[model samples]
Target: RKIKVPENIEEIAREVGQIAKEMGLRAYIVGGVVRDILLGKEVWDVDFVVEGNAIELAKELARRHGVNVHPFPEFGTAHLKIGKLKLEFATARREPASLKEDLIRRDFTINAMAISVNLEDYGTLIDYFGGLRDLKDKVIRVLHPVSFIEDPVRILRALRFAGRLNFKLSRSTEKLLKQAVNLGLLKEAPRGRLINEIKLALREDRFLEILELYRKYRVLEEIIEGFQWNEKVLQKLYALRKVVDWHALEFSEERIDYGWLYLLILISNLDYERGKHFLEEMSAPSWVRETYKFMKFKLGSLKEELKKAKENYEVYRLLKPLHTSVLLLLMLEEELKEKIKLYLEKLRKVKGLKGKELGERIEELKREIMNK
Candidate 1:
C-alpha cells in the first residue's frame, strides 16, 4: 500500500493529482512506478491513470509545468515530460466493452492497480484485481482467461518481466501463454518490437532459460526466422558470467547486443574461415566483420613464427600497453566498476593516442626487437 515518488518530482506529481481532483476526475499513479517502488528497484517513470478526461488532465499538466504533454487521444494516453522525468497518463480502463480491444486494453493484474492522490486518501490504492499481491510476490499474472488473445505482446512482457525479476510464470499463466501463441494470435504484432525485447532478454543473466522458452513457444522463429542464436550464444553468454564473475567484473548491458565481439571471442579457438561463416550467418555489421577479419589477418601473419618461439612473456609485448588494461580486467573483475568501463577507457587513451607518437613508438619497438 506504500509507494514513494522521488522527492524532486513529488511536488509536480501532487500538482497533477490535484488538477485531476479539481476537475472531478479520479487520478491515481499506477503501473511500473508503483511496482518498482514495492520491489525496492529504481523507479524510472511515473504513471497516472484517471477514470475520466485523461487528455484534459494532461493538457492542464502541460500548462501548469510549462512543459510538453503528448496526448494520444486515439489511445486515451499522454506523456508529460518535466526535466529528465517522464510521467505517462492514461485513462483508467474498464473491461473491454468494445470490439477493437488491443492487447493493451484489458489491463493485466500487475498493471491494473492505481493509487488515489487527492489530499484525502492520498495513498489509497484501487484494486480491481489483486495487483498488490502479484507485485509483492514479484509474479506476473493476467487478470482474465482471454488476456493473451486480446493482445499478444503481453506474452513477451511476461517473459521479459520474469527474466528481469528472476521470477517464474504461474502454471495457469504459462498454459494460457502457450495456448495464445499456438493460436497464431501474435502474428500481427510488430516483429521488430519483439526483436528488441529479445535483445533485452538476452542481456539478463538468466538468458538461457528465457531463450529456451522463446524457442519452445516459437517466438524465436516468429521474430528471427531461418538462423538461430540458440545455445551457441547462450553458452558464450554463460561463459562470460563465469569469466566476469571470476574477475569480479560486472558485464556492461551494451554487451548484450554487441554480438560481434562476443562471437569472435567465442570462436577464438576455432579456425578463421569457420568463424567467418558463423558471423556471416548471424548478419554481423560490416565494421565488426572487417574488424574480425583484420584481427585474424594480423594474428595469422605472426602465427608461424610465434608457434616456433612463443613465450608467456612475449604476449604482452605483442599487444603493448593495450594489454595493460585488458590484463587488469582479466586478472580482477572488480577493476570494472560498471558496464562499458573498458570501452570508455580505451576511447580516451587508445583511440586518442597521438598518430605521430604511435608511429614513433612502433618504430622504436621494431628497433628494440632487432637488438633483442
Candidate 2:
C-alpha cells in the first residue's frame, strides 16, 4: 500500500520523481517528512535523499522554476522553496555504501523509513527495520547503541519529539539515555546545534516537559550555565509562554522575537552579574543582552512606574524605551497587559504632520500637552 501524503505537496513530489527517473537516478523522501506523514501531522518541510549528487538534483529542480538553490557543500545537501513547500535534498553518504546502511544510522527507528520518489516504485515505503511497528506503538527507539556517542544532539532531539508527539521511549532507548548522562555526552554536541535545539524546544507548547526531560537527562545544566530550576521558575515560565503566544496572536501585525522572553524567565533565578556572565558565555546577540538588561535593572518597580503614569504620552515614554521581549514579560499580569495594550495599540499608532520638522514639532507639542 502507498503511504499517504498531503495532496497539495504530492504534486511537487510527483514532478520530482519524474525528474529523477529521467536522470536515471534514485530519489526518496526521507526522515522527518516520512515520519510526519505516518503521524498525520502537518508537514513543515519535505526532505529528499538522492542516491548520488543531491546538489545536481537540487539545481535541476530549481532550474525548472528558475529559483535560487541554497546548497550546503559540507553536508552534500541543498535547499530550495517552491510555492509554500520547503524542500531539502541530501545525497546518500559515500560512507554508507548502501541505502539500508544509511537508514540504519538514523537516530530513531520511526525516523529511519523512506518513500521512493522514482516513478515505478513511487510512494513505496522503504523501511528496512521495524519503523512502522515503533510508530504504531508510539515509541521512540534508537537504531544503534552508539547513536548518542556519535551525535549527542540526538538526545535533545529525542526529547523534543517525545514531548511534541506524546510518545514514550523504549526500555533500551531509555537505558542508552542514562548511559549518555553518565558519560556526560551533553557537552559533546556542538554549541550552535545544541542552542538551536533549545530554541526549537522553546517554540513548542510542551516546552516545560522538554525542559524537564533535559533536566532529567542532566543535559540542561551541562549546556546552560547558572540555570537553576524550581517550581517558581516553572510557574513564571508557564505564564510567560502564554503571554508570548498571546502577543503573537493578539498583535499579529507586529513582530516579536520570543526567545529572549522565555530566556529571561528561565534565568530569573540568577542575579544580573551571573546573568551577564551567562549571556556572554552563550555569545548571545545584542537584543538578548538589551532585554536582559531591562529585566534585571528595570523590571522590579515597572508595575508601579506604569501605575504612576497619568497619560498616553507618559505611557509611551516609559515603554518606548523597552525591548519587545521585556514588554511581553510585563504582559503576564492583567494590569500590565492593559497598560501595554494601550501604549501599543493607541499611543504608538498616532499619526501627525507629514513635513519632517512639522511632524517632530507636532509630536513634541502632543507629548507636552498630555502632561496637564
Candidate 3:
C-alpha cells in the first residue's frame, strides 16, 4: 500500500534488491526520485541506498548482468548504466545512523523519504521526516537545525526546490533561511558546487521565479557583485528569456548553455573590463570563460561589419567564428535583432570553404544561394 514505480526502473531495482537479499543486506530507493515517484511524475534517474556495502552489491549486479558499474570507493556509492538508464546506489547507515540517519542528513523533508526494494518488504516506504505531509502541504523544510551549516549550498537548493516544485518554505524554514543569509554561509560553500547549482537553476523552466526567490532572500547581492535590481534589469531578463526560448525552438539540437547566456545578460550591466572580471567572479567553467574570450575578440568588428554588409555570406562570415551565446546576446539589441535572426535562421547553415581564391569561391557559393 506504499508506492508504484516505473517498469524499467522497477525491474532494475528488483535486481538490485535481489542481490541485497542474497548478500544479507537491504536496499531502498531514496531521495529525489522517491519524491518524484510519489508525486506521480515520471522519474529520469533511479537512486538507491543500501544498509551495507553498496559497492559490493553493485559488483555483484555488474557480474550477473554483464554490465559496467562505476564505484566511488570514498563515498561508498556506485553507478550502473544499463541501456539508457542510470542507477545510483549508496550504503545506508543504521542507528541513530541507519536509513533514518541517512534520511535526516538530506536537505529537506520533501527529499528525505525512501522506498524499500528488499524482497520481503518490497514497495514499502520509509519516512522518518514528514516528506509526504510536506509534499501534501506544498512546503519544504530542513529536518535538522543546521542543515545550511552542514552544506551551505542548501540555501540555494531550498530556494531552488521552492521554485522548481512551486512550494513555499515553512515559516520556521523562512526564519532559518534568513539567518543563514545573515550568517554568510552561502559565501563559504564550495565554488564549483555553488556555480553548478546556479547552472541547474537557470535550466529550469521556472528560472525567473527561482531568481526572483534569490532576489527575495537577498542572495543576488550577497553572492553576485554588481547585480542591482531594477525594472530595467528585469525587462532585459524578460526579453532574454524570450530570445532564449525562441532559439530553443529553431535549433533543438543546438547546445545553448542557458546558464551562461543568462549570466551574459546579468553581467551586461557592467562596463567591458568589469564584465570580464564579473565572469571571473562567477567562476564559470573553462569552456564558458573561453567562449566569452572568443566572443569578445570579434564582437565589435562583427557587428560593425554586419550593419555595413547586406549580402548573406557577408553576414555568415561575420558570425561564423562567434559562439552561439554571443549571437544570443546580440539578439537582445533592437537594431541587430533582424540581422542576427537572418544569420542564425538562414545564413549560418549555408556552408562553403577557405583561402583568398576559395574565400571568394566560398563567398560566391553562399552568394549564389543568398542571391536567390
Candidate 4:
C-alpha cells in the first residue's frame, strides 16, 4: 500500500528491529499496526510478534530505551511503554507453524496482516488472507465462523471496529453474530470483560451507534434487562459527553469519573435494587454504586428545592454538597441549566479561603447573585 509510517514510529521500530537482530530474533510488526498503516489511519497500538523469546526482546528494548517492560511470562507476552505509545510483544505460536499461519488464525481479515522487521523486508507486506482487499472494501469479516466462540469478546470488538471504521460486517460474519446471540454465547462471557468492551466503545463518538448495535444483538437486555433505547436517552448520552469535556476544561485538577457518570445516566430511571445488582454484576467500583443510590435518593428533594429556589443562596445551599456529576445530571434539564451555570461561575470565584473567610466570601457572592 506504500503506507506513510510516522517518523517517530519508524525510528522506534528500526531500533526494536536492530535489538531483535542482536538477540537472534525475527520481529514482525503485526495486527492493528499493519491494519492502520494500510487504512492510512493514525496508529496507536504497536504490536509485534517475535519468532524468538519475546520477553527477552522486550527487556533489551526497555534497557536500551530506559523504559520499563511489563512481561507476562505465562502468556509469553510483554508490553513496553514508549512515551504515550504502547508497544506489545508476543512470542510467535508454534501451533501457528508459520507467520502466515499465525496471521490466518487472527479474528478478522483486516487485522490479520504483518510487516517484516528485518532490514531488507522491514516494511514488506505479508497478507495471508486478503486483508488489504477487505480494508479497501470496508468490510469486517471474521477469519472463521467460530472465531467469536474462541473469544466472545471479539464479537463486541467487531461491533466497535465496524462502527469506528464506518464499515459493514460481511454477510457470513453477520450471520455468525446472529447465531452467537441466539445461542446465548454473550451471556457466557465474564461481566467484567463485557463491561470493559462496552467502556471502550463508549469512549468513542460512535457510542450511540454501538449501543444500537448492542440492541440488535440483544446484548443490551442481557446487561440491563428491558433497557430502553430512545431519542431522549440518545440526547442524554450526547449531553454527557459534552458535560464531561466541559467539566474537564473547568476543573482540570479534579479526577472525575466520566465513565461512572455515564453509567449513572444509563441506569437513572431503573429501579434501585435492579440498578444496584447490575452495577455489582458489572464489577463497578463501590463508590459508583453508592453515589448512584445517593443521587437517586436526593434527586426528588433537589428538584423540589430548585423549583422553590428564588434566591441565589437558596440555590447554593441546595447544591453545595452535590457532586459535579450530579450537577451534570441536573444540567441536562432545561429548567436547571441557567441556575447551574450561575452556581458554577459563582463557585469558581470562591475557591481560596477557609473557615470564616470562605463562609463570608460565599455569603457575599450569594448576595451579589441575589442583587443581580
Candidate 5:
C-alpha cells in the first residue's frame, strides 16, 4: 500500500525516481520522511538514497526540474531545494553489506524504514526491523547496543523526539541510555551540536518537560558542568512562558531572539562566573554571549535604579538601552513589575523615529509622560 505523502513531495519523488531509472541507478526515500509518512505527520524534508552515483543522479534530477543542486562530495550526498521543500540525496555504499544492513545500522528503529523510489518498487515499505511496530507502540527504541556510543547526540535527539511526539523510550533503550551516561558518552557531542539541540528543545512548547527528562538522565551536568535545577529556577522557566506571551503582545512588530533569551532566563539563577563559563563552554554565538554578559553586568544595577525613579523619563532613561529580554525577566520581580509595565506601555505608544531621532523622540515622549 502507498503511504500518503504531500502532493508536491510525491511529484518530486516520482520525478526523482524517473531520473534515477534513466541513469540506471536504484533510489529509495529513507529516514525521517518515511517514518513521518507512516505516522501520518506532515513531512518537511525528504532524504533519498541512491545505490549508485547519488551526486550524478541528484545533478540530473536538478537539471530536469530546473532547480539547483548542492553536491557534498565528501559525504557523497547532494541537496536540492524546490520552493520551501528540501530534498537530500546520498549515495548508498557498503558501510556493512547491503541496503538492509545499512538500515539496521541507523540510530532508531522508527527512522530505519525506507520506501523504494524505483518506478517498479515505488511505494513499497521496506521494513528490515520492527520500526512500524515501535511507531505503533509510540516508543523510541535504539537499533543496537552502541547507538549512544556511536553518536551521543542521539541521546538529546531521542529525548527531543520523545517529548515532541509524546512517546516513551523502550526499556532496552533506557538501559543503554544509563549505560551511556555511566560511560560519559554524553559529552562526546560537539558543543556546537549541543547548542543547536538545546535551541531546538527551547523552541518546543514541551521544552521544560524535555529539560526535566534531561535532568532524569543526568544529562544536565554534562551540558553545564555541575548545574542542577532548583525550585526557583523552575519557577523562572514557567514565568518565561507568560513573559514570552506578553512579549509577543507588547512587541508584535519586533523580533526578539527567543532561543538566546530563554537560555539566559534558564540560567539567571547562576552566579555570573558560572553563567559566563556556561556560555563559554557552549560556544554560544557572539550576540548571545554579549547579551548574557551585558545582562549579568547591568541587570542588577538597572533593577536597583529602576526602583528609585519616580519620573517616567527617568525610568525610560534607565531601561531604554537594555534588551527586551532583560526587561521581560525584570518584570518577574515583585517590586519592578508595575514600573516596567508602565514604561513598556508608554514605549509601545511612541513611534515615527529611527536611530538617534528615534532615541530622542522616545526621550521626549518619556518627558511628556512625566509631565502629564
Candidate 6:
C-alpha cells in the first residue's frame, strides 16, 4: 500500500523511492510524520524505512537533502538533519525475536509505524504491528511485559511519554512498571540521564503533575533514594509550571528564572543533611548544589541577620542567576516584597555595571535599603 506524500515532501519521497528501486530495495516514509499527519499535528521529524540497506539509502537521501548523514550500519539506522527537521532513516525490519522485543527497541509506538513513500504506495501505513492502533488509542504500552527490566530507563521514558502525551498507562503495563521498580531494575542508572529527563519533563506543561505522579508512585524514592518529597516544593513546582505555561504574560518582562528560591522551597523542610545528600545523590552539579546550599543558608539566617538584608537584596543576593520575584515572593512572606522589588530593579540596571563600580553600587543600594 502506498502512503501519499505531501506536496512539500513528495520530492524527498520520490527520491528515496527511486534510489531504493534502483538498488532493488524497498523504502517508505514512516513513524512520526505519518502519525502526526493522522493527528493533524505539525510535523517535526520525518522518518523513513528501507526494505533493504538503510545506510546506503540514507547516504543517498542525505546527499539529496545536501546534509550530513550519520550512519549506524550495525543498527541499520541513519539520520540526516536538514535545518530544524531531522530525517531518521532506518531499515524496515521488525524484530526477529518478539513483539515485545520490537516495541521496547523503539523510542515509542506512536513512533513505531512507518508510512510507505515508494512511488506506487506513497502514503501507506505499514502496520507491521499495532503501532497505528496504539497511537490512535493514546496509550503508552510497553512493547512487552519485561521492557522495564530489559532497560530500566524505559520505565522513566514510559512515564515521561505518558505524561507528556496525556496518555494513560495500560493496566498490565502499569503492573510491569511496578514490578520493574520493585525489582530495582533502575539501580545505578546514570544520574545525568535522570537529570536530563527531569529537565525535559519540566519543559512540558504537565511537568509538576508528572513529578507528583512520580512521587505518588514512589518513583522519586528509587531515583533519589532518601530524598523526601515535600508538599511545598510540589506547590512551587506547580506554580512554576503555571508561570512557564503562561509564557506570554510572563515573558513581557524577562525570561522565567528558575533559582534556589524555588529549589530551596522544595527542599526547605528537609534537614540540611538530607537535602545535601539528596542533591548530591541526584548528582546535582557541584555549582548548582553549592548555590542551593548558599541560598538555604541565607534563608536560615532570615530572622537573625539577613532578614532585613534579604528584603533589600533577596533577588540578587539570594536569587542571583535567577531573578524571578514572583518565585521569591512565593517562598518568603508578602511583607518582604518591597525589599525584593528594590533588588529586582537594581538587577535590571546591572547590564553594564561591574568591577568596583558594580560592587560599590550594590553596596550603596544595600545601605540605602537598610536605612529605609
- The models' CA-based lDDT, in order, is 0.60, 0.80, 0.81, 0.79, 0.80, 0.64
Give a tens-digit lDDT track for model 3, residues 235-282: 878888898889889788995667676666665565667667767766
Top of the candidates by TM-score: 5
Q: Lowest-scoring 10 consecutive residues by lDDT in candidate 1? A: 95-104
Estimate, for each residue in 248-322, the C-alpha lDDT of model 4 and write its tens digit: 788788746676777777777788888888888767776777778877797878877897788777787778887
Q: What is the C-alpha local distance difference test score of candidate 6?
A: 0.64
| After superposition, candidate 4 runs with Cα above 4 Å error | 1-4, 22-24, 38-45, 66-68, 82-85, 94-96, 225-235, 238-257, 281-287, 346-365
lDDT of 1 by residue, 236-277 (tens): 556555555434344353132333344454445556786677
Against the hidden reference, what TM-scores do the models get?
Answer: 0.67, 0.81, 0.85, 0.84, 0.87, 0.74
Residue-level lDDT of model 2, residues 1-372, one tens digit each, is 577557867887888888888787788888878988887888858998887778988999899978999999999899999988899998887343456767888889999999987888878998887889998898988898888888888888999988877888888888898788678887666888887877778778777777767767777777776676788877877887777777788788776657556677788778889888877766677888887887788787887788788787878888887777777777876677888877766777665556888867887887875443
TM-score-superior candidate, 4 or 5: 5
Choose 3 or 4, whichever is better by lDDT. Answer: 3
Report lDDT (Cα) of residue 206, candidate 4.
Answer: 68
Task: List residue ranges in candidate 2 displaced over 4 A.
Answer: 41-44, 62-74, 80-84, 94-96, 271-274, 277-285, 301-304, 307-317, 333-372
- What is the full ranking by lDDT, best candidate first? 3, 2, 5, 4, 6, 1
The per-residue C-alpha lDDT of model 2 at residue 69 equals 96
Better of 5 and 6 by TM-score: 5
lDDT winner between candidates 3 and 5:
3
Candidate 4 contains a number of clashing pairs equal to: 0
Q: Which portions of model 6 miss their true places by more than 4 Å?
A: 1-8, 32-34, 92-104, 188-196, 242-248, 256-290, 302-372
Worst 10 residues of 4 by lDDT: 1-10
Mark the 10 consecutive residues where model 2 has the least summed lDDT. 93-102
